[PDB]
Structure formats: C-alpha cells, structure tokens
Structure 1
Amino acid sequence: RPNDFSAFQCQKKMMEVQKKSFEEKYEVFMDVCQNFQPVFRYFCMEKFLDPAIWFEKRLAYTRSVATSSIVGYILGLGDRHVQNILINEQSAELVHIDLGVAFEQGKILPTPETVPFRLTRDIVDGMGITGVEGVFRRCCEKTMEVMRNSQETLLTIVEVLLYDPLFDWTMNPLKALYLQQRPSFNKVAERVLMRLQEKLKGVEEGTVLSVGGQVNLLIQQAIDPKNLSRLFPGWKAWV
C-alpha cells in the first residue's frame, strides 16, 4: 500500500493526540485506520504458493492465534505489542515473548491496557476473508471449554506460582514507567486469585456466561475501536 499513510505518519499522528480529549483520540484513530489498511493476509500468500500448503499454514496461524489469545486472557498477559509477538516463517504459528507483564498488571499502567489480548485489524486480516468467524471463534470456544473444565488444577498451579517469594509479578512504579516511556502483597495475591477464579467460572461482570457468550464478549472487547483508541501508541493498535 504505497499510497497509504506511512507507519511513521500514523505513529506521529497518534502521539500528537495523546494529551487531548477521548473524542479527539477516537476520531484521530478512525482517521488513521481509514488511511492504514491491514496487509497481513499477504504473509501466507507470498511464502506458500501451493494452495494446499497455504490453506494449512493459514489454519495453523488462526488456531495459534485463538489458543494464545484464550490462554493469555486466562493468565492476564499484557504488553502484547508488535515487537513482543513473533511469527514462524516455516509454520506461520505465533510465539509470545517478553512475558514479564501478566495477571492484569497492565491494567494498572499509566495508560491502561483495555484489551484482553491483541486482535487488531492485521491479526484478523491474517485469518482470511471470514475473519474471526469460523475457525477462530470455534477454537477459542474449545480452548475456553478446556480451561473451564480444568479450573481446579489451573487455580492450584497459579496459587503455587503467586506465593513464590522469588516471583516478582506485581507492578511497581519503576516498571510501569519503563514500560511506557516518552521523549499488602497477600491482599493483591488474593484479589488476583479471585479474579482468575471468576474468569475460569465464566463470571465477567457479575453475570454467569456460557463459553460462547464469554468468547463473544472477549472478541467484542478486543476488536472495539473505542478500546483501541485509548491504548499507548507503542502498542500500535492501528497495526
């Protein structure tokens, strides 16, 4: 897309509106998204010329995205910017690195992360013409069903994790400032454990939801432009 906005232009426009109203942020984000169209669908096309291999790699990519999204939401993974996610060139599967921020500590950040996972326009465009519908939603539902069926074991494992003395998982002002720079412990652990329990039982806003309903809510929250417009520019929600 040579005639669209450059990534530098989008980044500059996004930083300019940072110290402005939320309406201005939303309108600037919409204008940027108008002149910045996703191109990730070309990743599998240019690498896998054979249609069968192309279809297999695209299916593997979509399944990997669904599984990673559900698991990261369960663990509250944050800081999922473009440089923290890698794609395998041979297998088209996603690998998540830089796992320092987890258990919804990113919501404590100065510019809070309003999305459970990264489901931006490029990520959905990489899934094909159907988008989130089809393979992605069904795989998300399957992963959430498995997570719900194993809530006791998962809760026990996270309990063992959170009380590890050497596990520095809580957010501190120095870490928060380093994450977003521009030119009682028992109480917190119990709160995080109870939030994880609510997630594993399907309770989101005090109402019990089915697996499909919870998946729908997560997808709607992740793809909502209003949430994406509020995010830190380093997250690159337009990409």
Structure 2
Amino acid sequence: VMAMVGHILGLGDRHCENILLDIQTGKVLHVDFDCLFEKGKRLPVPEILTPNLLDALGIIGTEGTFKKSSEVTLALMRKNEVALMNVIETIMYDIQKALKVLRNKIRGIDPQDGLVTETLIQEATSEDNLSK
C-alpha cells in the first residue's frame, strides 16, 4: 500500500537508504519522498519474495489464502480509496494528475486496459503483489 502511495504521488527511484522495516509489525515508510510536481519522476535514476515466499505460503502455494485475504483487503482498499489517498497526500516534500489516474487504477483501472490448481499461477501474479 505504501508503494502505491509513493509511486502514485510520483517520486521515482525510492532510495534504499530511506526504507526502514520494523520487526514489530512490518511498517514500510517513505521518509522524504520528494514528489511534488513529479519531483524526480522524470529523472527516474534507478530504472530497474520469490519462490521462497511461495514455499512458505503453503502446500497449495499461494492457492486461495493469499488473494482471498488480499481481496477482502481489496474490498478494503477500494471502499476508502480517497481516504487512503489523502493518506498518500503526505509525499509533497518540495503529482496531482498522476495521482488521480493511478488512484483510478487503485479503484480498478488496468495499465493500457479499460478493464475496471491455476489460481496458484494467477494470484501469485496479482499486481497488488508483483508490480514493483
């Protein structure tokens, strides 16, 4: 969620130095995230959980649990898109239009698409999991 937060208010190339990952809960923070007026998004300096995660996911791999949980979570992360968006709003540090298009994405729009045991191969490839 914080990754969509950041790369929808348009920072680009989040420094690995900034990311801190608490052992208590797993929070993933952006400290500066200079992103007002697409700060650094045009620059894109860096223009860059594998099978180990799937092994730990279960005997059926990702089948079920992951995306069922994550899709009740989808019901969560689309009902309050605008609330989590104003949560996003905290990436000014110096933008809006990209934020709007990609929060439409949050609501369900797909890249270059008006669109608004095999789930082992599907949900493991869920964009909300594998996009970046």
TM-score, normalized by length of structure 1?
Answer: 0.35
Gaps of 5+ in 2: 8-13, 36-40, 117-121
Q: Within 1, Cα distance between the matches of 2:124 and 2:82?
A: 20
Q: 1:203 aligns with which of 85, 91, 109?
A: 109
**2 CA distance for matches of 1:214 and 1:194?**
26
Q: Which runs of 5+ in 1 are unaligned?
A: 1-70, 89-93, 113-118, 169-188, 228-239
Give 1:19-30 correspondences, 5 Å limit.
Answer: none
Name the % identity. Answer: 22
Greater RCO, CA 8 A, separation 6+: 2
Q: 1:84 to 1:130 in 2, by over 3 A?
A: farther
Q: Distance in 1 between matches of 2:47 and 2:69?
A: 31
1:172-198 Cα distance to aligned partner (Å, 9 max, x none):
xxxxxxxxxxxxxxxxx1244124322
Structure ID, larger Rg: 1
Shift of 1:110: 2.7
Amino acid across the alignment from 2:44: I
In 2, Cα distance between equivalents of 1:202 and 1:153? 16
Question: Which residues in structure 2 correspond to 1:1-239 (within 5 Å)?
Answer: 71-76=1-6, 85=21, 95-97=26-28, 99-100=30-31, 108-112=44-48, 119-159=49-89, 161-163=90-92, 167=93, 189-205=95-111, 206-209=113-116, 217-218=126-127, 222=130
Q: Distance in 2 between matches of 1:199 and 1:214?
A: 18
Q: Output the CA distance in 2 between the equivalents of 1:87 and 1:108.
A: 30
Count of paired positions:
111
Distance 1:201 1:123 in 2: 27
Q: 2:91, 2:29 → 1: CA distance? A: 18
TM-score if structure 2 supplies the norm length?
0.57
Change (3 A) 1:150 1:109: same
Q: CA deviation at 1:134?
A: 1.6
- Once superposed, what is the RMSD of the aligned Cα atoms? 3.9
